Amino acid sequence: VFLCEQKANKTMIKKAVEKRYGVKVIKVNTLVRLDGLKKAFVRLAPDVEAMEVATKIGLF
Amino acid sequence: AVRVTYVRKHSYNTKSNGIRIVKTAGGNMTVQHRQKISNGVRCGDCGCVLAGIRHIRPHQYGWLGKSKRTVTRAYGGVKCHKCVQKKILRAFLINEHNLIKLAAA
Amino acid sequence: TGHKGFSYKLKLGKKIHQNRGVPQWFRMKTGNTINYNFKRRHWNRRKMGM
Amino acid sequence: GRRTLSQRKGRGSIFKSRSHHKLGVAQHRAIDFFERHSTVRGLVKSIEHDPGRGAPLARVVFRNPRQYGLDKELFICAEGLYSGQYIYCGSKASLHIGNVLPIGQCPEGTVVCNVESKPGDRGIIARASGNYATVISHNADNETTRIRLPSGAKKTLKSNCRAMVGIIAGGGRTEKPILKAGVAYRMYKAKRTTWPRVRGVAMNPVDHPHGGGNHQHVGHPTTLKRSSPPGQKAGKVAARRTGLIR
Amino acid sequence: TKGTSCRGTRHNKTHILCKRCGKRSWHLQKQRCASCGYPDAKMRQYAWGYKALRRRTQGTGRMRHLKIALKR
RNA sequence: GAUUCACGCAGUGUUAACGUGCAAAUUACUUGUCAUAUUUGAGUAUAGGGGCGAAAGACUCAUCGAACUAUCUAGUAGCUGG
RNA sequence: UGAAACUGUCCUUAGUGCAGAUCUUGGUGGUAGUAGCAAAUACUAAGAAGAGGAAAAAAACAUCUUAGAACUGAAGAGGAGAAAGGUUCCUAAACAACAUUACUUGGAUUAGGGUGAAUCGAUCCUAAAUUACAGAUGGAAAUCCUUAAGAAAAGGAUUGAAAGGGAAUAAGAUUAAUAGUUCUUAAUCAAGAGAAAUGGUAACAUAUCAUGAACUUUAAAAUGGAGUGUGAAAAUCUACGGAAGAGUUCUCUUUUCUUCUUAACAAAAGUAAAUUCCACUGAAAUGAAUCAAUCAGAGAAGUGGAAUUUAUUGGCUUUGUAAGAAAUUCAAUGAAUUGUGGUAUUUUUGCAGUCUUCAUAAAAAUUAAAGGGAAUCUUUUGCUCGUACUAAUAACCGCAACAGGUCUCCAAGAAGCAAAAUCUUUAGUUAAAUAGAAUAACGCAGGUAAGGGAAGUCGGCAACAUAGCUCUGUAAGUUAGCAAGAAAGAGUAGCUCUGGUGAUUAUCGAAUCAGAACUUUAAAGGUUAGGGGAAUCCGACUGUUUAAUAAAAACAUAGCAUUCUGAUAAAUCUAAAAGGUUCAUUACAGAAUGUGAUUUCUGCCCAGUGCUCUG
RNA sequence: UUUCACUCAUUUCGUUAAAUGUUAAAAAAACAUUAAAUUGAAACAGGCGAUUGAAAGAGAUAGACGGGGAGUUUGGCUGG
RNA sequence: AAUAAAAUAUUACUUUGGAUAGUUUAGUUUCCUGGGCGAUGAAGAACGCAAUGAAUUGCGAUAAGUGAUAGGAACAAUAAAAUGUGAAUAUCCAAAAUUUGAAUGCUUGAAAGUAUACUAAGGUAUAUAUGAUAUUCAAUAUCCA
């Protein structure tokens, strides 16, 4: 789950996530919050596991 | 009895907002969206409903097979068989009469 | 309403963001008179008319 | 005072015609060579009910004397027409009911309907239900013919004005007595906003010139000059006579 | 019933936010702004409304570019 | 555009309640009415000597025998008060 | 007391002296601990948390759990939406203020979290209508025109619907809160990528098949309402057979209650109702048929076929999905079951004909077919925006937690003609501007009353009284339709029985009607539920009306009558206008008036004032 | 000045401005197009076709009419 | 006839209130100098940006600030880091300048969008009227082979 700019569509976010973390993305759902930010739910491919990305990013 | 609720955000009993309530596992009843009742085709002359063609929505005819949207006959799908028979006799009898009346009477 | 235009929704969100009090640290500044936000409102008290 | 109801009628806000379900403009087809010097044959596909008017309308279909396709016309039915009938329009058309002929070819005493006051203007006179005009006489010197209008007036038209032979269908419509206020309400479904008519004497002096005092009465003569301004022209206008006719 | 009872059905907006002046004065049916005089090219100003002039005019906003030029 | 009951609606009577009220017009019972001249939502049209009115000078945002708002305007007062 | 400026005399100057102006602004009294904190049936016991039930009864105690007792009564005080609100949603900490006592509660304070769509909507199309360039008009602002005026737009520009049209998604599970949106499983749709067919007599039929351009036509999208009959599904009820659990049980009850289910999309074992057509034949002694109709030599009935519709494929059972889910039990994650029917009621959804209109009850986007003959299964992608919550006796509009107002969907049992009143099940709630004691007057709301019975009063105002169903009976008057439920009289309970009304071919089934013995507290009446008659006036009737003192005899109405106009007109809006309304019209029409159904009848007057004259 | 004849401004109209003018040569609810062989499918006018027409409309000045509308007035004394 | 509970009156102190006195980073008037906006996109509006910000101030995806030139040791409510190899602070300078707005490709309601061309995504140009030049055309409108 990421917070992204409103002016970015689902295609831009999917490509951006792949470029930033070198992973595979299969589905992106976006909701625009009240404050103005766009919350994106990026689901990765089954082979790539999101626990390794979370610790590599630093969420844990 | 189990009472139900509209699933979509339409809240009025409009023609396009028709629903059906069907039973479902656990005794619950769910809501379906039923299609509008449509008319078929009509003969171009006598205005009678043609046989052999289903009464569905206009776009659903493209989904049907090529043979299921017409009748294998001259003017099939636009004119009834009675409509067609009168067309043939008119075309032949009038032409034959023209050969005898005029055109070397 | 459940249905709203995109621009209208953002103007709703700002009104939510502006309905906040003074942070405590700003209240400890020297020569500070701004203790409470007099532009505040609540849904059941004053309708923001938008 | 105020502005009376006849003044508010000329602005057309709620008094606009309720013409949404009407079939269209009912008239002859546009004049051409094939109608001036020949005959074009049309087929009466169907007879339909046009809202707001008492006569049925015929959906005639001429072919296309100059191009490829169909010329879907919309005539006013003459009494006796039927579906599948052939009708011929032109100067050489036979004198049969439903045929369209120039008014000069009709013998004196012919009953016509939907006559053009001017050549090629596609029908003016004798268009209501059961109405007709009679050819009085011809005048080949200046190509004019005399006809008797349904109001009884005599009119002189050019001898090449077109008309349809017969009687407009749906006659005897107004002989059936309306019985209920609701029935009259339904009559103006496809007409203008006029029906529930409040008497001027029941209004107030601001509303109407008739708006009276302690007794419901007019007070001044109800026969007025033609030159009265809009606003006081209420009642009988330029009345040459009054009272019950003998 | 011209008082309390009649105000029950007031749930249909007449004016919405305008785009040129930002006030809730855009008449929906009239398709015009009652305050800043929208699509009309000129800003709506009247000499009888002297106060309405001093509420929105030059110098009541940011003056993002004009402040540099006049100081220049 | 028959007779009635019901969901609803209106407002005949009590000239009941309340009348610094639940309410800047409501409540209770009684009464009437309760689908074709019916009831009703949204959209749309008609603007102040104008609109709209099955007509009461009725309605036109609690404002109507001429709305609201601002300018002329600190309108004038042989009249009242200080 | 106060802690940094000020005073006396002479001239000068003035925004220079207050008790009043219903004076202006601010503050404060008596009234006064007074009037009140009384609609919406209602609370109680034990325990927990808390400073917050103490006590010589200080008789009352907010929140949560359990138990008792209750209300809304399924057209709801239930579960969800449109508008409007805008974070009120969920959780935690915390109770200074606010919810007419209090509150540990809150829609209140503080801080976090929360809205996931190729398939639902917006976006697309057009309706009433709306707005541009050029043109026309105007002193001006600006107005008109919307395809007519144009070197503009094969044909006509912009906008206009979260209820009209519309490509395509469902079941289960999941969160403190989102879910046709997430997860599992299973689907669908659009755009892409890898001399040209047979069968049937015919109606017509063939897992893509089996070529089909320009141009043209037809159809669909896309059409009122009423009433009757009927197909199917669901709910309720019920018949037979059970399996599991629960309740009652010293009085009985082989007993009473709960569960026994299944999606989108497709398949085609079995089998329906209705309508329309095709082939053979040719109907009179006329037949066929419906609740009603309606139909036949331009061809009935009969027999054999074809097609379409019936909430997705093809209507119902059945099948795949799919039992692996879900429900009900059991054991301590693992085990069990998940038949078949009904000539019953309601709802929903179709179908068939009938009736009715001086009413005939939308358009486009978009799709298919035809006439014509020009030319020679796998895979990718599906963008933008809304999505939380209330939707109201507390989230919307009325200054508010206001007995007012505000558009919709789903809808159990009893009883009954009834969606009526009354009671209950599923769900919701016991709080919704404070209570305790005593039981005066005067009240508001609900009642009864001896004998008399409108004598009260402006007036039977208010209240009493009649009230359902069956049978008998029903006048004058009348527009012959009505009056009429006229008026008036009798019957009605419980229990035990008897008979009539069918289906299928002896078995099965329906509430309905009639009748008879016996008993009693002698029977519609708990609730629901017309007082009746004799006349007079006005208005013919159904309808409308002064929002907030007049609902009517007033307005409307149908009917009757009068006037003008041949459309380049009549009426009439505009400052002007290839401007606008009736008029998408054409005298059976348009415009202006009076009277007010029907019956009977509308008398005399043209001087006066109007109107008019073909003078 | 009146009465005529015309159209040429002008008015009112109609269409896809689709054969104008002058020479030349009711039996049948059906189809009709993208031509075979410059013709086929004739030429020209200085008029897209009708209609009205020097009259009518709009302007100026003048007379009449005009509560449809605008502005204003409706003396004083007074056993009220 | 008697009581001083209430009532009344004076003073001191305290309370509710904010008069009076002292004071001014605010106004009013006159005068002097200018009167310097915009298709190179103005005035106005909207949204966003601070380590802890809700308003306000400043600013624009380079964000309470960047470069340059002056300037010389601070800011502070609390931390951090930077800092004489240059902190604050100042500016008619340089770069940069979101969505709109005359708003100008088309649409615009609270509307999300979208067409073509040039240089997938990004960025430019394309409204109406108008002057000059260039180029392509139309009309026998005038001649004319």
Is there a contact between A35 and C9 if contact means CB atoms under 8 Å apart?
no
Give the integer Cα–Cα distance in Å for D127 and E50.
Answer: 63
Amino acid at B90: R
Task: Name D residues 37-66 whose Cβ lies under 7 Å from strand H.
Answer: 37, 43, 45-46, 63-64, 66
SS3 D218: coil
Closest residue in C to E23 (Cα–Cα): C50
CA atoms within 13 A on the CB side of E11: 3
Is there a contact between C16 and A36 if contact means CB atoms under 8 Å apart?
no
- Contacting partners of chain B (3+ CB pairs under 8 A): none
Query: Residue B16, CB, less than 7 Å from strand G?
Result: yes
Give the integer Cα–Cα distance in Å for D42 and D195.
Answer: 39
Q: Long-range contacts made by residues D143-151, C-beta under 8 angstroms, separation at least 24?
A: D143/D104, D145/D103, D145/D104, D147/D103, D147/D112, D147/D115, D149/D125, D150/D125, D150/D126
Structure tokens at D38: 């020949």
DSSP B42: B
H or E element in which residue D102 lies: strand D100-102
Q: Which nucleotides of strand H come closer than 7 angstroms to any CB of the protein?
A: 13-16, 18-20, 26-33, 49-51, 64-69
SS3 D48: strand
CA of D37 to C1' of G155 (A): 30
Give the integer Cα–Cα distance in Å for D90 and B61.
Answer: 45
Q: Does A36 touch chain C (CB under 8 A)?
A: yes
Give the integer Cα–Cα distance in Å for D59 and D76.
Answer: 9
**What is the DSSP code string of D156-198?**
EEETT-EEEES-BSS-S-TTSPP--HHHHHHHTTTS-S--S--
Give the integer Cα–Cα distance in Å for E42 and E52.
Answer: 15
Question: Which residues, 6 or more positions from D110, have their beta carbon under 8 angstroms from its beta carbon?
Answer: D95, D134, D135, D165
Question: Which residues, 6 or more positions from D12, have their beta carbon under 8 angstroms from its beta carbon?
Answer: none
**What is the DSSP code string of chain A?**
-EEE-TT--HHHHHHHHHHHH---EEEEEEEE-SSS-EEEEEEEPSSS-HHHHHHHHT--
Q: Does E24 touch chain C (CB under 8 A)?
A: yes
Closest residue in C to E18 (Cα–Cα): C50
Q: Resolution of the coordinates in A?
A: 3.0
CA of A10 to C1' of I101 (A): 31
SS3 B15: helix
Q: For Cα atoms B6, B10, B12, give the angle at the middle one, nearest 5 degrees.
A: 90
Task: Name D residues 175-234 whose Cβ lies under 7 Å from strand H.
Answer: 209, 225, 227-229, 231-232
- D144 contacts D156 by C-beta, under 8 angstroms: yes
CA of D16 to C1' of F67 (A): 27
CA end-to-end span of chain D, whole Å?
39
Backbone angles phi, psi at C23, to 5 degrees: -65, 150
Place of tokens 């942070």: C23
Give the integer Cα–Cα distance in Å for D129 and D96.
Answer: 20
DSSP E32: E
Give the integer Cα–Cα distance in Å for D35 and D120.
Answer: 11
CA of B3 to C1' of G253 (A): 36
Q: Does A35 touch chain C (CB under 8 A)?
A: yes
Is there a contact between A35 and C16 if contact means CB atoms under 8 Å apart?
yes
Query: Residue D66, CB, less than 7 Å from strand G?
Result: no
Give the integer Cα–Cα distance in Å for E22 and E36.
Answer: 9
- From the CB of residue D163, how many other CB atoms can be counted at a distance below 10 Å? 29
**E2: which nucleotide lies closest, measuring CA to C1'?**
G547
- E24 contacts C49 by C-beta, under 8 angstroms: yes
CA of D175 to C1' of G54 (A): 97
Give the integer Cα–Cα distance in Å for D83 and E57.
Answer: 73
Radius of gyration of chain C, Cα coordinates, nearest whole angstrom: 15
Q: Does C11 touch chain E (CB under 8 A)?
A: yes
Give the integer Cα–Cα distance in Å for D120 and D157.
Answer: 12
Question: Which residues, 6 or more positions from D144, have their beta carbon under 8 angstroms from its beta carbon?
Answer: D138, D156, D157, D158, D159
SS3 D53: coil
Q: Which residues of A touch C12 (CB under 8 A)?
A: 34
Tell me which method was used to determine the 3D structure: cryo-EM
CA nearest neighbour of D42 among D85, D80, D95: D85
Beta-strand pair D144-148/D154-158: antiparallel
- Contacting partners of chain D (3+ CB pairs under 8 A): none
Q: Which residues of C touch A35 (CB under 8 A)?
A: 13, 16-17
- E23 contacts E17 by C-beta, under 8 angstroms: yes
CA nearest neighbour of D75 among D110, D109, D48, D36: D48
Interface test with A, best of C4, C8, C10 (most A CBs within 10 A): C10
**Residues in chain A, overall count:** 60
- From the CB of residue E33, how many other CB atoms can be counted at a distance below 10 Å? 23
Closest residue in C to E26 (Cα–Cα): C50
Backbone angles phi, psi at B18, to 5 degrees: -65, 145
Structure tokens at D235: 């009642």
Q: For Cα atoms C8, C14, C17, give the angle at the middle one, nearest 5 degrees.
A: 150
Q: Does C49 touch chain E (CB under 8 A)?
A: yes
Structure tokens at E17: 């936010």
